[PDB]
Symmetry: C3
Subunit: 116 residues, 3 copies
């Protein structure tokens, strides 16, 4: 298989592939696509109960520079992901409005190559 998955704590990016790898870590929560194909992304955002700062609650999934998903509901643990045909050089990014909006001991996301 080719899959990777960022989070949750105590972990960060972890990966499983053959050679060559289909994807590659770019940084926390962010990943780069090295092989064209059919990818299921998946993951869940569990909002943090206590959060009380000014910033509104929103979590954003990016495909490169484009938002591909928004998470607005601040009480449901929500699912992130979907089936995406991605191309080389493609990035993917989960981006929380505050850092403390979210329970990192329990929030994360990941990716699996399904086909070519």
């Amino acid at each position: 298989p080719c899959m990777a998955k960022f989070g949750p704590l105590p972990s960060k990016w972890q990966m499983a592939s053959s050679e060559p790898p289909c994807v590659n870590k770019v940084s926390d929560w962010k990943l780069e696509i090295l092989q064209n194909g059919l990818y299921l992304i998946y993951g869940q955002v569990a909002p943090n109960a206590a959060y009380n700062d000014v910033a509104p609650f929103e979590v954003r999934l990016y495909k490169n520079k484009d938002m591909i998903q928004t998470l607005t509901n601040k009480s449901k643990i929500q699912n992130v992901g979907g089936t995406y045909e991605l191309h080389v050089g493609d990035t993917i990014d989960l981006i929380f409005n505050s850092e403390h909006q979210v329970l990192k001991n329990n929030t994360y996301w990941g990716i699996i190559l399904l086909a070519n």
Copy 2:
């Protein structure tokens, strides 16, 4: 593969795995997870046309004790499921408000292990 699928009538739970099984029937509509991994759930709820009791229309998918999905629309045959990384001891449950809210000759849901 590892997959199972409850419904629709005339069937109930049916299963396909290797040894050991990744999941296991707990009861009608309810299933237990025996192997950690990446699961696609899927299935559809076709609301029953004639339904006229007092109880409001809602169908609920549970991951263990938590609602992971709600079905409110009572005219669309709706899709249930999603991509979920589940863990051992995890249950999953489809729970219709009335029993007669739904066309059981045509409603069901299922699961497939995608990876580890």
Copy 3:
């Protein structure tokens, strides 16, 4: 694998299977199911920026004669698809309200057999 995918331009229907094929082109955007099973559909609709005719914006995905999906948002590039257990003789169709509602140089959809 068994997968097929219509679009985008300069391409049309393209296919990859073993023998026998699990699906078959019926015509542009339209496909027929020849093997029962678990199918992920996927694809994206990128609305066309300039579109100014009278017809309201809506794109519809059909399973046979039934709408299984509606695309109403005319500014988001939207995802189409989902996990579907389909049966033999089943068709699938993406149907744009106008033809010029959409950027065909960048809109499409596809299908992959996951299991039996």
